[PDB]
């Protein structure tokens, strides 16, 4: 629901929704229209 959401809150007040207690879906994040930029500042992105 995060990356596929229709609308996002504007950058002045931005969408905060919790992702919790769950198995990280990054395995499925591979196939998509992908991304303008994909970045991890405090980790190696392969470590997700």
């Amino acid at each position: 629901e995060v990356f596929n959401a229709t609308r996002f809150a504007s950058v002045y007040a931005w969408n905060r929704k919790r992702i919790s207690n769950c198995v990280a879906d990054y395995s499925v994040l591979y196939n998509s229209a992908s991304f303008s930029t994909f970045k991890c500042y405090g980790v190696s992105p392969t470590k997700l």
Binding site: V43, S44, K47
Partner: protein
């Protein structure tokens, strides 16, 4: 102690940073810790 490096757990850099920056950070740990030995080694030599 951080000694100016991002963290004092030697492998919690390595998760965060790609090595070539860690190689810069781990210096400030080594350089920090190393110096911290001599200061301890000396204080033993003097006390001894």
């Amino acid at each position: 102690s951080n000694f100016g490096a991002i963290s004092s757990v030697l492998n919690d850099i390595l998760s965060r940073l790609d090595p070539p920056e860690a190689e810069v950070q781990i210096d400030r740990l080594i350089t920090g810790r190393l110096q911290s030995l001599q200061t301890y080694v000396t204080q033993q030599l003097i006390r001894a």
